[PDB]
């Protein structure tokens, strides 16, 4: 069967066809805020004291549709807050709280996101007051941060500026067709590269050990691997788990078969709420969220060093949750009736979750926690730093943090860049520098490839990398395989440093130029020289302001995830990619926040400009040496050429003319633009007889967009 | 192994396969357009040189290509088949299909079994498209190639009108639910199976399928017979070899083929060995010249079932009957006469037979009917005649175009509009009446074929005035009479030659009601108004052709008829897509029309405000209230009642009303206009959307 349009569509006949709809995600037509809504200018003016008062009033006020445990919705807001930021993953930077996707993405219905719909609904009275001055993404994490502040914990700081989105970001979470699927492992615990979760729908880890096996060692291994795949080491992981579970409790009062469907498969009358329980009242003393009934600490609404005292004070035999789940309880009934009830009444025995004994059984976590057992100040500092890192991972450079709560110091995981310490070049020194660069003896190909390598490391997901920082001469990026440290990127870098030294030593006044600015300027000078060679007199815009980071300010391991395993624009293909070359090219274009016409012009320009990996002729459908001409598209649509795969199986094709002599050679990413019906439509726009000026100006616009992707200090 | 990557089609539809897909509302965004935002195609094609354009197409047709050799040397019949396959997907019941957007070059259509060998046809035209570029769209070129092919082989066509704008992503259209390529349900074919119903070679049974499928695209018996007789006067059918040697369709073909599909491994694979459908029929002895030889052959011999070399039912002349009188595309022996299984329908069928026998002696009538039918075919979804461009548009108008009179007087502006608004408000008509009438006039528009709308003043004419959604035997006649009284009162006391038309008064009364409601709510605004509409008469309105425009479900008026295929939620998004509205525009329109009182039969279903006839955002603030517990009505009416904190029913709503508070994507938009200090934004957005809807069919001012 097939569904008309609003149920399904074209992906049914050909399930594995190239999907170009990912390149126009979040269109401005679907934005209800108009094309003049500058979120930064709005959120820069809110009153944080009033917002804190409103959030505290919401936390301390119980609501009939979701009775508050202990008369406080703080712990629920903390859980919501990190579950928003717990979907981040360093593989590609997707996920996290930077987009507020917890509302309508394919989560909002994940088994671990149970009872978080009520948490987001409880904050409507706050969002109602501030409207557009405060986004949902900002409010979700600020609610948890303010809950931590109100429950006695002094946090590091906070930064506003997470722009809302009005369309689910299509993120690959796994190949498992059913919830809690475990088809993402090979041999031992070897979680597949794209994913960062043990199962499907689980944020971090099943709270029963691997696949329901209540073994603290294996659970510890899973915790370590899962947190490692989200930029967290052992100390930060232990701090996060200890601090987070200091507050609140779990909800496993009744059997889980009485819980209704998820919000996305719920009746209309529920108003977008899901998991409606039929046990008892269904809320409050009879709430069911995960099936485990554990209260870790005897003061679950205050911050103190009581989680570790309880953890190391008992023996933790194994028992069963009243909903039928695995959990640990203090042996010999020690400390019975010492844990208070959420809604008044009898006490509880001390219970620990199956993954909470990992912190005292695994040797690494055991040493860390035993250190924190008698040194609560270290735990407080570590938790503050880890929480700050967790909330602001995918928010980008420090220039994007708004509001008055931003901390003053810099952290290495932010990829800090130094502030501008001189006066920027403008409109005359730029011309002189471009003249010097074009007279420096570097070819168009070298400059263009160096500029693209510097700038095409940006990810639109977590806004890491980019041309700012001048990090292409630093160790992680100067040695990448795609960058070819052998044949180039050393002559170019040395020449650019010589030019920078010569200019700075003689520039008037206190005007200097940074290395990154000079790299981008050389790229632009090469572009305009090639355009002049083609026959067009144009000027590539340049925005100075970049600064040079140092080696000590660059984390080599943190940058290892930005290395491209496949760069279709440079016609480079590494090893171990999950998909063919064209799909990887679309993924790269989506990461660069490009559209389809922009991708087309960038590919067609970089092909003829000589910015190919190893300067290979794969895709150079031109006879002009380094001229920004309209030749890639003209020769791609020519049917005087018959394409057929190379006799030596390489993933490369050769195009023979009418005389049978091989004229062109190409790859998957070169022929996909002439084969795909949606892409050939764009290629035919620039392949027309009168499209060379339009192609040149479009290429310059796309190039300037790519160079300025990471310029958040001027935008 | 399920749950593929989002880059290869993964997404939320894999988890919940029957959820509201809001991506149909942001379809074909401006960011995917390579031409930019300042591109005006109407100002580009108007400067084209048709004389130089026909000169290129002719030398393209008369120049064989090594990769697709030409049959008899001319590529004309192939272009005729392509042009009609482009326009042959039109559907009257929703307007989707046709050559309006040139979707034949995109994924759904370019890989249909009937569109075989048409990927080669669209590529032979690349040299023409290369010369002109943005001055000539693919959609315009595809049909102009067929028109110029008809002209080149001796047929004088009616005319041609440019103006089809290219779109850059395939249009999602429901072609049927079969999940297998190739009646109770419609298969993957264009009109009918060439071998008869379900492969049964009976021509009498194929006649009824032809009649039904052509009637479902606004063609009667005379136009159906003329189209088939004229189209099959040219060209031949390609069935030279078995069909198992044909490769995959273009969407499943490898990259070597550069977007071409159906690569044949039989013989050379092209030309003398071409395999497209597998029937191998040459209808006429002069397949590259227009003449009255199709009907002469059809009525000149007796026919007989045989099989094509590929294996397929076809008719050949009895006992020889002039073998070798039909030339083959590439020099060789002649062939005996041969007719398709659906071409005998025009002979053995009581209705078609009389028409074809009449044309057998009067070919001039056949030529005239074919010209008219072809012109109607390639211009079904152009819309109003004001959208035709180029120096080839015929002067005289046609009934199927929904003609309206030209403006024959001075237009009101900015001084009579103010006075007209002042007496519409003081005429006794309530805000609900005016708003409902204005919405009823302008909601008939559908953006697929650009039919209907406020222009023409057809809300008072026979088809629309009697629609169930329009007047539940109520105010519509009273509003129409009052507006006409105002019209004849204003026209007599006019300053000079300034006069106003009835449709203009309908839209202006809607705008005046909006202004009155906004002033009641506390905002002083002005709804933009662009005069220029005219009034059509009853004879210029075809009652039967307007019957398909009747809304079976209007989510904005909270009306649900009978015979809808999907629940009320999905039909609302379908109509919003037909009105070319985005999700915020749909949201503001739904939230504003409820409090204005535009509900069908003035029902309280979804009126979440206490003081009606006032343009507030009370719908959104009362939808997001969590003090209201929604639960289905005791009677299975499909309505829900939301009780207060006590056991008192505070509000009542329907599926369309409650889906905005339930769908997570739609609730995001509701929380924008439902927030505090968000009422001025809501008023401005509602006014912008209302003005956009009022001016949907105004192609005479663009
Ligand atoms: C940054 C790390 C973490 C933080 C900040 C955190 C915080 C919290 C808080 C405050 C609660 C109480 C919710 C409430 O009382 O409504 C909670 C519940 C819970 N946590 Fe975490 N936790 C973290 C890590 C983990 C990990 C690694 C697991 C592994 C299984 C886990 C599993 C659970 C479960 C199953 C619940 C029960 C929720 C319910 O039943 O309603 N958490 N968490
Ligand atoms: C019930 C109606 C029709 C049926 C079943 C039908 C079927 C067919 C089939 C099966 C072919 C063979 C194509 C191939 O094998 O390459 C064909 C060819 C053709 N058709 Fe139709 N057709 C119909 C109506 C029309 C109409 C309305 C037109 C034009 C207005 C038309 C114009 C043509 C032309 C010109 C060709 C020749 C193609 C060529 O020479 O390459 N046909 N038709």
Numbering used by the authors:
A (entry chain B): 26 to 740
B (entry chain A): 24 to 205, 221 to 740
Give sentences copied directly from the paper behind this entry.
The homodimeric structure is predominantly α-helical with each protomer (∼80 kDa) composed of two domains. The N-terminal domain contains a heme b and substrate binding site, which are essential for enzymatic function. A covalently linked “MYW catalytic triad” is formed by the conserved residues, Met255, Tyr229, and Trp107, which is essential for catalase activity (Jakopitsch et al., 2003, 2004; Santoni et al., 2004).
After optimization of the grid preparation method we collected a dataset yielding a cryo-EM structure of WT KatG to 3.7 Å resolution. However, on addition of the pro-drug INH to WT KatG samples, better quality grids resulting in higher-resolution cryo-EM maps were consistently obtained (2.7 Å, Figure 2E). During refinement of the KatGINH dimer no symmetry was imposed; however, despite this, it is apparent that the two protomers are nearly identical, with a root-mean-square deviation (RMSD) value of 0.4 Å for Cα atoms when superposing protomer A onto protomer B. However, there is one notable difference, with protomer B displaying density for residues 206–221. Distal to the heme, well-defined density is observed, which is consistent with the previously determined covalent linkage between Cη2 of Trp107 and Cε1 of Tyr229 and between Cε2 of Tyr229 and Sδ of Met255 to form the “MYW catalytic triad”. In particular, we observed three potential binding site clusters rather than a homogeneous well-defined binding site.
